[PDB]
Amino acid sequence: VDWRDEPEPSACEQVSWFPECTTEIPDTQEMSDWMVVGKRKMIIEDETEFCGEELLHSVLQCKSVFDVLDGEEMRRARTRANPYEMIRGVFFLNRAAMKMANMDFVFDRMFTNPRDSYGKPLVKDREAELLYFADVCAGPGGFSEYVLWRKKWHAKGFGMTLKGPNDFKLEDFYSASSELFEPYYGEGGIDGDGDITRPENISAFRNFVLDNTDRKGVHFLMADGGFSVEGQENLQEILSKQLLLCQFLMALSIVRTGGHFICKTFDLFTPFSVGLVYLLYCCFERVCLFKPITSRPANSERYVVCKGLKVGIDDVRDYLFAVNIKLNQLRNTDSDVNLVVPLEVIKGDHEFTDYMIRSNESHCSLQIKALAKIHAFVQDTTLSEPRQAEIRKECLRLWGIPDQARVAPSSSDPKSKFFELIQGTEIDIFSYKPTLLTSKTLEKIRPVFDYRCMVSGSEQKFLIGLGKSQIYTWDGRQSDRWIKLDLKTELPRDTLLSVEIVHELKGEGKAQRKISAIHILDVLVLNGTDVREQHFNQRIQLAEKFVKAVSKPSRPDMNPIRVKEVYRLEEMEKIFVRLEMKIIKGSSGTPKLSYTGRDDRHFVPMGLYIVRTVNEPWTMGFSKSFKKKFFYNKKTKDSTFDLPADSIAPFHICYYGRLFWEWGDGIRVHDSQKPQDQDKLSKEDVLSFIQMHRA
Amino acid sequence: MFYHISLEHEILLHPRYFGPNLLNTVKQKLFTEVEGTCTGKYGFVIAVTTIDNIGAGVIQPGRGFVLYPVKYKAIVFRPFKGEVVDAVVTQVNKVGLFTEIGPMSCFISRHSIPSEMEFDPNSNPPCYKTMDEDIVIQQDDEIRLKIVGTRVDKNDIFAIGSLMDDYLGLV
RNA sequence: GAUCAAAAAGACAUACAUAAAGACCAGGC
Ligand SMILES: *P(=O)(O)OP(=O)(O)OP(=O)(O)OC[C@H]1O[C@@H](N2CN(C)c3c2nc(N)[nH]c3=O)[C@H](O)[C@@H]1O
Numbered sequence A: 001v002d003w004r005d006e007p008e009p010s011a012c013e014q015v016s017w018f019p020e021c022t023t024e025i026p027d028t029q030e031m032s033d034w035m036v037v038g039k040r041k042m043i044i045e046d047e048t049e050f051c052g053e054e055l056l057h058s059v060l061q062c063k064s065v066f067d068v069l070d071g072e073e074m075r076r077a078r079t080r081a082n083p084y085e086m087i088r089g090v091f092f093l094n095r096a097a098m099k100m101a102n103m104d105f106v107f108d109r110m111f112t113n114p115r116d117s118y119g120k121p122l123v124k125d126r127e128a129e130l131l132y133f134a135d136v137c138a139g140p141g142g143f144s145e146y147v148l149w150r151k152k153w154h155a156k157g158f159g160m161t162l163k164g165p166n167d168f169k170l171e172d173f174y175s176a177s178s179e180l181f182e183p184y185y186g187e188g189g190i191d192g193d194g195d196i197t198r199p200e201n202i203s204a205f206r207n208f209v210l211d212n213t214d215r216k217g218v219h220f221l222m223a224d225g226g227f228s229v230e231g232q233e234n235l236q237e238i239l240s241k242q243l244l245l246c247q248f249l250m251a252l253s254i255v256r257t258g259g260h261f262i263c264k265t266f267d268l269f270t271p272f273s274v275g276l277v278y279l280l281y282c283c284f285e286r287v288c289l290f291k292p293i294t295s296r297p298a299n300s301e302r303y304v305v306c307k308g309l310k311v312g313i314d315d316v317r318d319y320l321f322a323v324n325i326k327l328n329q330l331r332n333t334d335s336d337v338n339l340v341v342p343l344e345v346i347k348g349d350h351e352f353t354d355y356m357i358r359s360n361e362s363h364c365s366l367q368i369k370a371l372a373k374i375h376a377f378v379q380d381t382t383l384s385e386p387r388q389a390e391i392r393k394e395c396l397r398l399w400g401i402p403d404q405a406r407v408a409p410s411s412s413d414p415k416s417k418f419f420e421l422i423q424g425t426e427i428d429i430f431s432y433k434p435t436l437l438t439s440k441t442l443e444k445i446r447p448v449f450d451y452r453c454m455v456s457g458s459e460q461k462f463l464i465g466l467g468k469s470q471i472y473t474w475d476g477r478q479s480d481r482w483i484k485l486d487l488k489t490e491l492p493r494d495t496l497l498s499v500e501i502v503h504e505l506k507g508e509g510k511a512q513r514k515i516s517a518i519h520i521l522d523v524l525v526l527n528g529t530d531v532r533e534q535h536f537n538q539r540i541q542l543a544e545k546f547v548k549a550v551s552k553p554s555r556p557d558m559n560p561i562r563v564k565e566v567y568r569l570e571e572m573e574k575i576f577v578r579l580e581m582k583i584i585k586g587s588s589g590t591p592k593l594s595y596t597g598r599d600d601r602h603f604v605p606m607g608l609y610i611v612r613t614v615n616e617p618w619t620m621g622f623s624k625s626f627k628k629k630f631f632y633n634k635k636t637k638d639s640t641f642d643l644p645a646d647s648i649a650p651f652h653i654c655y656y657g658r659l660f661w662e663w664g665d666g667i668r669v670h671d672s673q674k675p676q677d678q679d680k681l682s683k684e685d686v687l688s689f690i691q692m693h694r695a
Numbered sequence B: 001m002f003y004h005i006s007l008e009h010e011i012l013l014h015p016r017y018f019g020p021n022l023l024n025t026v027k028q029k030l031f032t033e034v035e036g037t038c039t040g041k042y043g044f045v046i047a048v049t050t051i052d053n054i055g056a057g058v059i060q061p062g063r064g065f066v067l068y069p070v071k072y073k074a075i076v077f078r079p080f081k082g083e084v085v086d087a088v089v090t091q092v093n094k095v096g097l098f099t100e101i102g103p104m105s106c107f108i109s110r111h112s113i114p115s116e117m118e119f120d121p122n123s124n125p126p127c128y129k130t131m132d133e134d135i136v137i138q139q140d141d142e143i144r145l146k147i148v149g150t151r152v153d154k155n156d157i158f159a160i161g162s163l164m165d166d167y168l169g170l171v
Numbered sequence C: 001g002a003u004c005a006a007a008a009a010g011a012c013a014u015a016c017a018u019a020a021a022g023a024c025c026a027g028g029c
């Protein structure tokens, strides 16, 4: 084998795609006989249906030449012989992250910036939308680190992998906020085994993923499944066949319409593996088989890459689910599922077949040259790839990856990190107390439409996230120390929030159970994205998505993070309908005022914050002729029905201008409260004032 | 139980403290040395109420320190066996709930919990809920316990309580 | 498929605790 007739190593990669599948998506009646059960075949030498016999025998022979070689001698020759080996993981936890960095460049950012069929981005970082993704068989989540690092918090990841030495090392995400990721191990959630091949893990994960994606599914799935086949490397395809099927079935289970899929595979000689690729070609707008230069040249590792999940894939999903049940029934028997599509159907698509053969034979030819090159670099130890450092620098430049070492974050103290995150904003802005709402200050809530309101359940605090459980709170006074938060919860680094701590009582009296929860009032920085200058509702839109991003529903032992329910001030009437007199554990049987949330939980309210969302000289009126709200500039006298950019109240104006209507003793806000103090504003006084000033 | 008593102390002043602010330093030295401490004789010294009298300083022979006897009024906490006090179960440990009576910790053995209060690990926040449910007995709840015994290990006192009598438990 | 560590200056690791007691004998000022 002349390996010296190889093309000069390059950072420029070419993609060949399958043609566009012109056949309809197979239905339950068409697929009804496609599942052929035969004898368990553990022979790869005669799998010539989609590759020339001479090339198949040549690549198998070139693999088996290493069976007599010391693994450390092979590994050292391979490290000298591979032009791309100096890329490694760069600053990421492993070299798998760099495969996703490479492929997300080669595929036009379709994973990190997915598009509709009109080429428009499906996720905009300024709008309330998150990039949902999934990562399966993916421990320790190197692929996930690149995606989370690339999109910061504007992404939410869902993970499933086998429990054990190869579980998710979320602690080792030095470049990404691990709080934006949620591992789920199938049946039982956090306590499951994570077996992708097992159907129950697939089902529980499937329901969980759809629920955590507004019942739409993820924008894309990544799948990097593989296990050790030490001393059986030639049988890697046949051994991994059920894992390949379960990753493809997972794509059809949780990827949204128009979504994308990427899966690791090995060899694709068997009619079983080719029939699985044919089903993906039916189910997606475009499919390709691709080996990135970050994959080692001498191994069978390649990726199937699928773009645009079609509508009507349900029958193919439910077929592959039945085939997985059949494979599980045939475990440890002399029988196996040998076909999932008939050979006559696959070979009837000549355009699919001509791509499949050409993809296999091209891969075999390159793998044979790369195996012969490693063998020569074992025999002669003076051989080296001189361009490895040049090629590395060009690949990192091309893919937009900074050339920096993996450094454990740095440990910043919460005070120094707060000064970094505020970027020279005056610290005194964080010390401002709310104006109390009283009969003397009631006029300040004019004009009513400029305001939002929310029910408070504790004193307001600042909260900083330094990563994982390194969460600290501060009470806004320059004299006060940052205090470590004693709650079982996790937050991405570079997070700065305005919060309160609210205990959520469940039930009443002796049976009552109260759980404290983090309640976000407003947001400044979300995983290194500054949002302080965005409109209060717009900042809250980013805040609401963030709570889901850091959510952990498989972990009922964790303390919840929530966003406060924000009301329009002209709709404060809707708050009092959620006030109830409940028997709290320890109140000697005396009912206490309780605000009931969106779930079956309540807290004791302390009062109501009133926050200005419109900046001076602007204010919001209501046009009686147009039946629409409008912005009015008090200085220029201009009027518009669109939001002026200079009318936006940033965080510092919202925080400084805030009022607080305290709900202590003598204040009537629910009809069961007696007696009322005449010097204190009731619900009726505040609602009457609001009604007079709506018009 | 909380008490208001008269206590004494000897303040040993390092020679640097002398000079102008001498009497003031004694009071500040006193506040720092007794507040937060605990003893078996009087228990936890919660705070110094008033300083009645400052004794004339006597040079101690052979050492720099000069000792000022000090009479002061303080608030102390000294528990007794059989007394009922309201406690919060900081830790619902399976072996027993850990209840902090003010500044003093108190352990209620599981064996001293009525048999109707089964321990429930599977509940979201762990708790010894009553078998049907009825009383969760979890974190932040207010309970009534009877101190069965006290101990003092390294100036710190801790107690053991029981829930066997009637009208004890959840509040 | 992912990953693939070298034994951290030893301080009688410290009281040099060999220094039996007990006795008689010799000498010193
Ligand atoms: P990966 O495990 O699929 O492949 P990798 O990138 O790690 O490279 P490597 O295993 O070292 O070798 C590349 C290909 O050769 C096969 N091997 C490895 N190996 C130790 C071995 C192989 N084949 C035979 N017949 N005998 C052997 O002792 C790997 O599986 C890769 O395909």
Ligand SMILES: C[S@@+](CC[C@H](N)C(=O)[O-])C[C@H]1O[C@@H](n2cnc3c(N)ncnc32)[C@H](O)[C@@H]1O
Pocket (backbone or CB within 6 Å): A094, A096, A097, A136, A137, A138, A139, A140, A141, A142, A143, A144, A160, A161, A162, A166, A167, A194, A195, A196, A197, A198, A223, A224, A225, A226, A227, A243, C001, C002
């Ligand atoms: C080498 S990893 C891929 C790397 C990963 N993409 C990353 O970037 O870190 C392959 C993973 O597949 C997992 N795996 C293999 N079989 C599995 C199964 N039946 N169910 C779930 N995970 C499986 C393995 O545990 C392994 O962690």
